Design a binder for this molecule. Structure first.
Ligand SMILES: C[As](C)(=O)[O-]
Ligand SMILES: C[As](C)(=O)[O-]
Ligand SMILES: [Zn+2]
Ligand SMILES: [Zn+2]
Ligand SMILES: [Zn+2]
Ligand SMILES: [Zn+2]
Ligand SMILES: [Zn+2]
Lengths: 105, 105, 105, 105
């Protein structure tokens, strides 16, 4: 249920009418795998409030560099086309709920 | 030229006239000292469009908690009484300028 | 099941052959609260392989700066008095098992 | 003089004679470009004591995943056949000196 973003379609994605939660991940990132199902389900339950997207850092160096990613996983919540929150590391469902409580209001 | 905020006066502060760029810092912070001058100059050059302030996370957990802060430093531009943009880590002069050019007009 | 470390007793605590996992946490860190119980069960179940400890970054800026902490929760595994692993962010029970696979033998 | 390590020749390098310092990097890494000359010079000044190598995480997902890499860059010093110390993020030459020189004899 997650939208797949690329260096090419990134800007378009975040200029949308719904906040966008972007998962910066990689295949080599063990925690990212474990997190995928949790994020997918999170996406399914709140598609009415936020769009959850994923960006493969291995294939999109431009966007990853632009937002200064330092560690993988890293999720950035975009509102109005700007980064307003940056979640570092594994995010359990309870934290996604708590951190995006505002956009989910 | 850098207002000090606390849990007690924080709410009032972000409800002021000008947008407020809040630097959440900690004594253990790595690039904060290296950032102090950058923020001073930034404040000096944008006195009319923004108020630069600092919040020591070591002594103000409530606000730090509320805004889901995890990285130090974290800069959050408040406009409309809510975060409109957030930057983490060391932000040099030009990057600060490029990143904020769009939320200060 | 979890010893408390400070700037004053930190060096002594890591000066041994038995691995020590140090959770660098803060009062303002929501995730950290959610993880305390996961860390506690882990400590109890692997006391024979690793010593689990906590260091409150708000009160211990020396050690925290020494190891270059940038975000909170950060757990550092020490072996032979040197940091051999830095786990960034929330660590679910399974990630702790995976990540510390080596020491758990 | 730094070696380029791959999933193919990785074990062969870290398993032998002298210590091996591996720089896990990525094209999107912020401080990696800046760190390149620093790693090269530190390597030369301690060539008898350590072999310095680079591993692109994108191109070599297996080794990256095996060592639980999360932050880019991550430096891991291998002794015998295992990690004896890890550093994350940008490191100027004097920090590589302060952090690794003593552990290299
Ligand atoms: C061996 As030297 C020049 O780093 O003291
Ligand atoms: C500073 As040295 C251990 O390379 O003589
Ligand atoms: Zn939900
Ligand atoms: Zn300007
Ligand atoms: Zn176990
Ligand atoms: Zn030296
Ligand atoms: Zn010397």
């Amino acid at each position: 249920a997650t939208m797949t973003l690329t260096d090419a379609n990134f800007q378009q994605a975040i200029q949308g009418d719904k906040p966008v939660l972007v998962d910066f991940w990689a295949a080599w990132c063990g925690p990212c795998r474990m997190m995928a199902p949790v994020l997918e389900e999170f996406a399914e339950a709140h598609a009415d409030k936020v769009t959850v997207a994923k960006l493969n850092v291995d294939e999109n160096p431009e966007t990853t560099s632009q937002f200064g990613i330092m560690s993988i996983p890293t999720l950035i919540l975009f509102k109005g086309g700007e980064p307003v929150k940056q979640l570092i590391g594994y995010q359990p469902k309870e934290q996604l709920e708590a951190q995006l409580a505002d956009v989910l209001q």
